[PDB]
Amino acid sequence: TLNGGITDMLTELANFEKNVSQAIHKYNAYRKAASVIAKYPHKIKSGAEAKKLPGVGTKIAEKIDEFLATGKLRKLEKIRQDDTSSSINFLTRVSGIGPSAARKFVDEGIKTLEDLRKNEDKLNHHQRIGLKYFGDFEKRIPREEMLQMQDIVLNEVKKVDSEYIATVCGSFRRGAESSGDMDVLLTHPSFTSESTKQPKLLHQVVEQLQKVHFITDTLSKGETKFMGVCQLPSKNDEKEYPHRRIDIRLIPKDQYYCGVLYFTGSDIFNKNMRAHALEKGFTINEYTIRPLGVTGVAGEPLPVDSEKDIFDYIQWKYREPKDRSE
DNA sequence: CCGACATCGCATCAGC
DNA sequence: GCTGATGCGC
DNA sequence: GTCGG
Ligand SMILES: O=c1ccn([C@H]2C[C@H](O)[C@@H](COP(=O)(O)NP(=O)(O)OP(=O)(O)O)O2)c(=O)[nH]1
Ligand SMILES: [Mg+2]
Ligand SMILES: [Mg+2]
Ligand code: NA
Ligand code: NA
Numbered sequence: 001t002l003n004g005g006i007t008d009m010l011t012e013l014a015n016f017e018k019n020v021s022q023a024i025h026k027y028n029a030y031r032k033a034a035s036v037i038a039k040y041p042h043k044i045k046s047g048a049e050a051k052k053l054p055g056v057g058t059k060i061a062e063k064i065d066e067f068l069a070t071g072k073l074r075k076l077e078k079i080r081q082d083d084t085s086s087s088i089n090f091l092t093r094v095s096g097i098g099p100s101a102a103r104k105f106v107d108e109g110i111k112t113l114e115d116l117r118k119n120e121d122k123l124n125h126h127q128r129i130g131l132k133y134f135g136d137f138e139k140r141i142p143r144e145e146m147l148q149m150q151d152i153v154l155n156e157v158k159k160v161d162s163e164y165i166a167t168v169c170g171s172f173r174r175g176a177e178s179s180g181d182m183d184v185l186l187t188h189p190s191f192t193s194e195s196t197k198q199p200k201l202l203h204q205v206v207e208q209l210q211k212v213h214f215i216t217d218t219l220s221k222g223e224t225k226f227m228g229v230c231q232l233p234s235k236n237d238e239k240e241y242p243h244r245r246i247d248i249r250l251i252p253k254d255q256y257y258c259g260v261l262y263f264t265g266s267d268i269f270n271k272n273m274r275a276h277a278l279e280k281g282f283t284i285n286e287y288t289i290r291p292l293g294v295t296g297v298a299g300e301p302l303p304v305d306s307e308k309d310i311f312d313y314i315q316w317k318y319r320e321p322k323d324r325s326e
Numbered sequence: 327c328c329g330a331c332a333t334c335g336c337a338t339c340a341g342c
Numbered sequence: 343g344c345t346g347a348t349g350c351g352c
Numbered sequence: 353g354t355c356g357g
Binding site for chain 1: 330331332333335336338
Binding site for chain 1: 353354355356
C-alpha cells in the first residue's frame with residue numbers, strides 16, 4: 001500500500017492484457033513489475049527510480065511518470081470507456097469464464113450478470129457454479145476462518161485414515177491475514193512416485209468432506225487435483241458464512257517438499273524461482289527438480305529432503321514462506 | 327536485435 | 343474409444 | 353513488456 005496506486009494501475013493493465021488482449025506474456029510482465037514495486041521499501045518518486053527495479057522497463061517507467069503527475073493513466077481511462085473491454089473484464093470474473101468464453105459470450109450478446117443468470121443453459125458445469133457463488137467468491141477469508149476451516153479438513157482427513165497428511169498451503173502458509181481460498185496438499189503413504197497401492201485416495205477424502213457437508217460443490221475432480229466449494233457451518237440464528245473456493249492436490253508422498261514448495265507460492269514467486277532454476281540449468285515442477293543437459297530435455301529427479309535442498313540446488317538463500325509473498 | 331518468458335491437471339471438443 | 347489441441351485455474 | 357546474449 002506504500003506504492004499502492006502504482007501497483008493497482010499495473011494490476012489493471014495486467015488484467016487487460018490477459019482477459020482482453022489475450023497476451024499472456026504482457027500479463028505476466030505487468031504482474032512481475034507490480035510485484036517488485038510492491039515490495040520496494042521506498043515511495044516511488046519517478047519512473048526512472050522505478051526503472052532501476054528488474055522487470056520495470058521503459059514503457060512502465062513512463063506510465064509511472066504519467067500516473068505520478070496526474071493521478072491516472074489515459075490508456076486506462078480509455079480502456080474503461082470501451083464497452084467490449086468492460087464486458088470482457090467483468091465476465092472473466094466468473095470462475096470458469098476465461099478470455100475465450102468471455103469474448104464468445106459478448107458476441108452472443110451475453111454481457112451482464114443478468115444475461116448470465118438467464119442463459120444458465122449456455123454455461124458448462126464449472127461456469128454455472130462460478131456464477132452461483134459470484135459474490136461469495138469475491139470475498140476474502142479472514143485467517144480466523146481459515147483456521148476454523150483447517151481444523152475440519154485435518155480432522156475429517158484423519159477420520160478417513162490416520163496415515164493421510166493434509167497441509168494448508170497457499171497464502172495461508174505464507175502467513176497472510178486473509179486468503180482468496182484454501183489450498184490443501186494431501187499425502188498418503190500408499191501413493192508414492194513408485195506405486196499407487198490404493199485407488200480413490202482423493203475421492204475418499206472429498207467424500208468425507210461432502211458427507212459432513214463441508215464441501216458443497218465440485219468444480220473439477222480427478223485422481224489428484226480437486227477444485228470445489230466449501231462452507232463453514234453456522235450457529236443457531238447466525239447468518240451463514242459465505243461459500244469458499246477450495247483446492248486439493250494429492251501428491252506422491254516422497255515428493256512432498258517439491259509439492260509443498262509449489263503449492264505455497266506465491267505464483268509469482270514460483271515463476272521467478274523456476275525461471276532462475278532454468279538460468280541455473282534446472283527445471284522445477286511440483287514433483288521434482290531435474291537438471292538440463294544441453295539437449296534441452298530434463299534429466300533425472302535430484303534427491304530432495306527439504307524445501308531448502310531445492311533452494312540450494314539453484315544457489316539461493318532459503319526464504320521462509322512468509323518471505324515468498326511476491 | 328530477438329527468442330524466451332513456469333509448469334501441469336482436468337474439462338471439452340474435433341478428428342479418426 | 344483414443345489422441346491431441348485448447349481453455350481455464352490465478 | 354522486459355530481459356539476456
Ligand atoms: O498460476 C499459478 C497459480 C497458483 N500457483 C501456485 C502457488 C500458489 O500460491 C498456489 C495456490 O494457488 P492460489 O490460486 O490459491 N494463490 P494463493 O494461495 O498463493 O493466494 P490466494 O489464494 O489467497 O489469492 O499454487 C502457481 O504456481 N501458479
Ligand atoms: Mg490460495
Ligand atoms: Mg487455490
Ligand atoms: Na528495470
Ligand atoms: Na474466470
